[PDB]
C-alpha cells in the first residue's frame, strides 16, 4: 500500500543520511571505483537483495541486485553510477560533490528499495538494482590503454548486457525533479596537423607565415582558430528538438600535445588535438568527420583526422508508461507537475543511452542540482521512486 | 579492374601462405593475442598502418586502413581472430584446418584483396577499413567465471568500432558459401536454479517421494528439463520470422547443468542449475522469453530463480542496398551466377554484423567455404569479389 | 555415472523435436536416467535393510551432484553428463554387486554409460564387543539411572569412526550425550561420568 510505504520511508531519514554520507565519503574517481562498489554490494547483501558483482575487472565492477515480485508484472531498473570526478550531514543538508554526482541519488533508490521490501509492498514485477562503474566520459587513446583508462564500455552497458535487464529503467541523477529521455551521442577526433622539416633551434628559418611554419605547433594555432569558429556554428546547425528534450550538441578541444617537454631543442613536425564533439541522435559520425576534414582543407593544411570514440545517442521509444507512473508519483509527493529540463541535461552522456540502445525505455530523474542536497528533497525522490515502482511494476506488460 | 584481377591471380601464393600461417597459430577465445600479433605485423609490412585496439594487452583487435582520395563511402572488412578449442596446411589446391574455415580463411581473402587493391593502385574515393577482431565466439562470463579469461564479444568488434573502426558500410567475411545474409539472431542466456530441500545426510533421506516433490533439487530438475525441452520445441516454431535479410529460426538449448559439488556428495543439494542458450529474433524482448520460462516452472508447481546472465540484440541491416548491390554485381561477374539465399541457421545465429548494425553501419556477412577445408580457387574468387565490391561502393558518394 | 549422447551442435543447428531418451544432449538423457535411478534407490534400501546385534542397517542412496557442460561455454550443448552417487552398503554387500545393478538400470533404458566407482569403504559390526558393552551398560545404569535404549536405524547406517577400529580388530562402539542445537551441561557431565567409569571397569579387567 502507498500509505504504509510512505510512513516506512519517514522512519528511515537516518538510514538515508548515513547511507549517503558513508557512500559519499569513499574515494572513487573513475578508474578506482572498487571500494564504492564493495560498499554497495555489502549494503545490498545485508538488506537481502542478493547482489552480484558484474564486471570485467575484479576492482572495477557493477553491482546488480533485485527485489523479486510475485510474478507477471513489468520490471523496473534503478540506476546510478559509482564513480566521481568528504561528505557530511549538517542542518538537513548533505554536503559533498560526491553526493550530488552521484551517491545522493543512489541512496534515494537504495532506501526506496529498502522501504518497499520491509513494508511488504505487493509488486508483481521485479525491481532491478543496478549500481554501475565508469559512467564518466574518460576513454583510452594512444598509449593510454586498458584497465586504468576504460569507463563506459565496462559500466552500464556491460551490466545490462550481462543480465541487468528490465522492461523500463530510471536513471537517478541530479535533475531537480525534471525528467529527460533524450541524450546526445559523441564522436572523439584526434586531429594531427603535418608540417616540418624539423631543425635544431640555431637553424630555425624565420620569418615564415604561421600557416607555412615548419613547426606544426604554429600551424596548429591557425587550425584551432578555424575549428573554434566551426564549433560556434556546429551547435546551432545541429540543435534538434525531441519529445524527451532539446539536444544542443556542443564541441570542445579537450587536449593538445606536440613535441615532448624533455626534448625541446628540435621543434616538432606533428601536432595533435583531441576533440569532444557531441552528436544529436540523428547524426552520423562520418558526416562530422568530413566537416572537420573540410575545415582542414580550406586552410590548405594537411592533417590526419582519426576517430577514437563513437557512441550513439538515443531518444527513448515507448517511454510513456514509465513517464506516466513517474509523473503521477511526482505530482503526489512534490505537489507540482514536472517541469522540463534545460538543453544541457538533454545534450549529455547519461546511462539512459545504453538502456535505450538495448530496447529498455529509459529516462533520467532525481533530486538536487550543486554543493549539497536537501535531505527533504532526497526523501521526496525516494518517495517518488517507491511509488513509480508500485504503479509500474503492477501493470501487466 | 582487369588489372586488380590479374594482380590477384599473381598473389595465389601469398594468399595460401597467409592462410596457412594464420591457421597454424593457436588462438581459442581467451588466447587470441598471437594471432593478433601476426596480423598487426602483416598489416604493417603492407603499409596499412595498424593499431592495436583492445581492453587487454594480450586480447586485442587490430584495425588498419587503405585511405582513399576523398569523397567516397568507406567500407569495413571484418573477420574474427579467435577459434574454437586442429592445425593448418596446404595440399591439393585445398587448405585444410578448422581454424581456416572459422575464420582465418575468409580473413586471408580480404587481407589479400586489400593488398591487391593497394599495389595495383586502384582508385578509391573512400577508405577501406581493415578490422580483425577478438572474441567473436559466444563464450560469456557467469558465476565464478569472470574477467579476462572468459570475456569475448564485449571486448571484440563492438569495442573496436566504438573506438574508431567506423565506416559507412561493413562486410563481415565468414564461411557462407557465397550466400549473403544481413539479419542475425540475438540471444538471452538464462540460469535456471530450481529450489528444493531441506538437505539431509544420506542416511536420513526421506523416501519414497514423487520426483516433483523430492527434497533433492537434481531430481526436480529432471522433470523441469523434460518440460523445457517441450517448450523449446514449440519456441522455435512460434518465433520463426521472415526478414528481407534472411529467415530467423531462433533455437533453444540447455548448454550446461550443475548441482551440488562432486567432492562433497554426502548431502544432496537443495539447489541445481541449468544454463540455457535462447536465441532471439530481432523483434523479441528478452523478458517475454524470461516470463515464458518462469511460466513453465510455475506450471509444474516448482519454485525457481530464472536469472538472465546475457542479453544481446539481433538486427536486420537497414539501408544495406548499396552494399548489397555492389556485392551482387561483383559476385555475378566473378562467380558467374546470381547469389543464392542462405539457410535459416546462418541467419539465426551470432555474427559480428550485429554490432555494426547496432551502431548504424549497415552490414552483411559473406564469404567462401562451408567444414574441413577451403578450395583455394574459391578463396581467390572471394578476394576478387571483395576487391570489386570495394571498387564499386567506395566510389559511390556518401 | 556418465551417460553418453551427442553429436553436439551449435545452438542454431539443434535438431528438434527428438524424444528425451534419444536427445543429442546428454543432459536431457540424464533426466530420464535420474528418474530410473531414483526408483531403483527407493527399493534398494528396502532390499538391503539388515538387522545386526549392533543395530539395524538401512542403507540409503542419494544423488549428491551432477555436472554436464561448462557454464562459461553454453553455445554448444554437451555429449557427456555425469552424476555422483552416494550409495551406502550394509556390511555384507560387495560394492560390485551394486555397480552391476546400476549398470542394469542403465541398460534397461537402452542408454550407454560409464559407471565408475571412485570410493569404497567397508562397514563393520563389532566382534567381541561384549566387555566394552558391559562396562558401558553398567556405568550407564549408575549415572543415568536407566538401562540403555537402542538407536534408530540412521545412526547405525552411517559412517562412524567405529568402522576403522573394527576393521583393525579393535572392537568399537559409539556413545555420547546429546542429539541438535545445544547440549545440556548436565548431560555432558553425565557422559563424562560414564566414560570415566567405563574405563575404571574395563581397564582393570585382564585381557
Q: Which of B202, B208, B258 sits opposite C88 (nearest CB)?
A: B202
3-state helix/strand/coil string of chain B: CHHHHHHHHCCHHHHHHHHHHHHHCCCECCCCHHHHHHHHHHHHHCCCCCEEEEEECCEEEEEEEECCCCCCCCEEEEEECCECCCCCEECCCEEECHHHHHHHHHHHHHHHHHHHHHHCCCCCCCCEEEEEECCCCCCCCECCECHHHCCCHHHCHHHHHHCCCCCCEEEECCCCCCCCECECCEEEEEEEEEECCCCCEHHHCCCCCCHHHCCCHHHHHHHHHHHHHHHHHHHHHHCCEEECCEEECCCEEEEEEEECCCCCCCECCCEEEEEEEEEECCCCCHHHHHHHHHHHHHHCCCCEEEEEEEEECCCECCCCHHHHHHHHHHHHHHHCCCCCCCCCHHHCCCCCHHHHHHCCCCEEECCCCCCCEEEHHHHHHHHHHHHHHHHHHCCCCC
| B253·C13 Cβ contact <8 A | no
Q: Does B127 touch chain A (CB under 8 A)?
A: no
Query: How does DSSP classify residue A211?
Result: G
| Least CB–CB distance from C63: residue in B218, B225, B256 | B218
A83 an active-site residue?
A: yes
Answer whether CATH 3.30.70.360 is correct for domain B184-314: yes
Dist CA C59 CA C158 (whole Å): 8
Give B360's contacts in chain A (Cβ within 8 Å): 284, 312
Spatial distance between the Cα atoms of B97 and B369, rounded to a whole number of angstroms: 12
Distance, in Å, from the CA atom of B13 to the CA atom of C171, rounded to the nearest integer, reads 82
Which contacts of B258-264 are long-range, i.e. CB under 8 A and separated by 24 or more positions? B258/C65, B258/C66, B258/C67, B258/C68, B258/C71, B259/B217, B259/B218, B259/B221, B259/C65, B259/C66, B259/C67, B260/B218, B260/C64, B260/C65, B260/C66, B260/C84, B261/C65, B262/C64, B262/C65, B262/C67, B262/C82, B262/C84, B264/C64, B264/C65
CA distances to A198, B179, C163 from B246, rounded to whole Å, are: 57, 11, 68
Cα distances (Å, whole numbers) of residue B288 to A391, A397, B121, B305: 20, 9, 53, 16
Chain A residues whose beta carbon lies within 8 Å of the beta carbon of residue B358: 357
State the DSSP string of C126-186.
-SS-HHHHHHHHHHHHHHH-SPPPPPPSGGGSS--THHHHHHTT-------S-------HH
Q: Considering the domain delimited by A1-182+314-397, tell me its CATH architecture.
A: 3-Layer(aba) Sandwich (3.40)
Q: What whole-number distance in Å separates Cα of residue A353 and Cα of residue C110? A: 54
Tell me, yes or no, if B294 comes closer than 8 A to chain A by beta carbon: yes
**Contacts of residue C35 in chain B, CB cutoff 8 Å?**
211, 219, 222
Shortest distance between the Cα of A291 and any Cα of chain B, in A, equals: 12
> Kindly report the CA angle at A252 between A249 and A255, in degrees rounded to 5?
150
Domain assignments of chain B as residue spans, ordered by start: 1-183+315-398, 184-314
Query: What residue of B is the nearest CA neighbor of A56?
Result: B147
Residue corresponding to grid cell 586471408: B108
Q: Grid cell 566520459 — which residue?
A: A137
Resolution at which this structure was determined, Å: 2.8
Q: Does domain C1-123 have CATH number 3.30.70.360?
A: yes
Is CATH 2.40.37.10 the classification given to domain A183-313? no
Domain spanning B1-183+315-398: CATH superfamily: Zn peptidases (3.40.630.10)
Experimental approach taken: X-ray
Amino acid at each position: 500500500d502507498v500509505a504504509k510505504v510512505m510512513k516506512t520511508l519517514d522512519g528511515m531519514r537516518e538510514g538515508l543520511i548515513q547511507t549517503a554520507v558513508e557512500l559519499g565519503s569513499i574515494e572513487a574517481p573513475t578508474g578506482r571505483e572498487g571500494a564504492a562498489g564493495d560498499y554497495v554490494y555489502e549494503w545490498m547483501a545485508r538488506n537481502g537483495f542478493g547482489p552480484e558483482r558484474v564486471g570485467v575487472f575484479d576492482d572495477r565492477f557493477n553491482v546488480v541486485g533485485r527485489l523479486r515480485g510475485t510474478g507477471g508484472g513489468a520490471s523496473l531498473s534503478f540506476n546510478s553510477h559509482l564513480d566521481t570526478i568528504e561528505a557530511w550531514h549538517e542542518e538537513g543538508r548533505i554536503y559533498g560533490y560526491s553526493v550530488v554526482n552521484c551517491k545522493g541519488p543512489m541512496a534515494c533508490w537504495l532506501i526506496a528499495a529498502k522501504a518497499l521490501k520491509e513494508a511488504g509492498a505487493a509488486l508483481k514485477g521485479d525491481v532491478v538494482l543496478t549500481a554501475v562503474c565508469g559512467e564518466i566520459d574518460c576513454e583510452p587513446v594512444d598509449e593510454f590503454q586498458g584497465h586504468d583508462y576504460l569507463a563506459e564500455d565496462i559500466g552500464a552497458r556491460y551490466a545490462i548486457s550481462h543480465g541487468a535487464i528490465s522492461d523500463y529503467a530510471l536513471v537517478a541523477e541530479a535533475t531537480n525533479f525534471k525528467p529527460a529521455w533524450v541524450e546526445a551521442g559523441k564522436v572523439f577526433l584526434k586531429v594531427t596537423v603535418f608540417a616540418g622539416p624539423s631543425r635544431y633551434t640555431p637553424y630555425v628559418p624565420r620569418p615564415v607565415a604561421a600557416l607555412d611554419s615548419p613547426n606544426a605547433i604554429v600551424r596548429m594555432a591557425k587550425l584551432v582558430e578555424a575549428l573554434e569558429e566551426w564549433a560556434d556554428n556546429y551547435e546551432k546547425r545541429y540543435t534538434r528538438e525531441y519529445g524527451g528534450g532539446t539536444v544542443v550538441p556542443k564541441v570542445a578541444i579537450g587536449a593538445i600535445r606536440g613535441g615532448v617537454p624533455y626534448k625541446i631543442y628540435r621543434f616538432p613536425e606533428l601536432c595533435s588535438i583531441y576533440m569532444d564533439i557531441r552528436l544529436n541522435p540523428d547524426t552520423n559520425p562520418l558526416v562530422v568527420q568530413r566537416e572537420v576534414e573540410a575545415v582542414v582543407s580550406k586552410l590548405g593544411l594537411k592533417a590526419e583526422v582519426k576517430p577514437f570514440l563513437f557512441r550513439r545517442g538515443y531518444e527513448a521509444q515507448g517511454i510513456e508508461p514509465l513517464q506516466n507512473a513517474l509523473e503521477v508519483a511526482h505530482r503526489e509527493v512534490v505537489g507540482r507537475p514536472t517541469e522540463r529540463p534545460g538543453s544541457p541535461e538533454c545534450s549529455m552522456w547519461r546511462d539512459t543511452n545504453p538502456y535505450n540502445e538495448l530496447g529498455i525505455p529509459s529516462l533520467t530523474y532525481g533530486c538536487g542540482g550543486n554543493t549539497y542536497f536537501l535531505v527533504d528533497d532526497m526523501l521526496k525522490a525516494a518517495k517518488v521512486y517507491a511509488m513509480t515502482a508500485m504503479d509500474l511494476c503492477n501493470r501487466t506488460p
